[PDB]
Amino acid sequence: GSHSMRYFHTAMSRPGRGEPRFITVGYVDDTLFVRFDSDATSPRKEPRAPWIEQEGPEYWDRETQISKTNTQTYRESLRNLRGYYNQSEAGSHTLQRMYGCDVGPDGRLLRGHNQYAYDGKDYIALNEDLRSWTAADTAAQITQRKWEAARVAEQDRAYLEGTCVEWLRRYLENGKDTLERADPPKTHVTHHPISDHEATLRCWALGFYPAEITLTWQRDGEDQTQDTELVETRPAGDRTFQKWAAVVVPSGEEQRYTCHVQHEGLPKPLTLRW
């Protein structure tokens, strides 16, 4: 199927409690494979998936240096942002970035990403053309001006179309037994009386990978969008995910309800009933 590689950067200021913390994690699809934390005893990029362990010392040295440099760059960015918003030195602020590439089954680029947020709000993003920026406000326009003057987008484009895609392809090959394996959900329906006159039907999906899934309830073949309770898809801790969807049904009417499950690992979409 299709795949993605994404890096996530976070820097968090903490006035009076040292310099801003900087972290990075990297993912292929829903698999975290590398991490860095400036607060670690000896900050280094560290492997978090077995298939990345085979990368040599040169890889780990380069990756660590990138993150050490980023720690300093992000501290400068945080200082600049505080000024752009006329903010006091006393408050704590957060800067986030996500960047990377999506590829299809043939490994060809579908699109690239390079986005930032300040205090959880979108700040600036590289457009899909990989040549221009969208700035959220007059502060981000300052960043945009600096980055246009420095032709940053051109560097992003070169990375996203080249290095990003090529290393994702390499990782998919090295990790093929897991990264290219979709695990279907194990499914069942449970029944929970609420009172004498109604009960909850809960449709469960367990043990699936990747996280993307569609669970729905129908009554008499009609989607029950408004009346369905969904929980957020949640990690099991063994790489897989879980989700459930529930409806409240009148006693005796259970056979009118069907649960529908779609997932990449299923040979066929499932219909289930109590």
Binding site: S67, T69, T73, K146, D156, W167
Partner: peptide, 8 residues
């Protein structure tokens, strides 16, 4: 692999 400074 990460992308190889430009502060905001």
């Amino acid at each position: 692999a990460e992308m190889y400074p430009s502060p905001l």
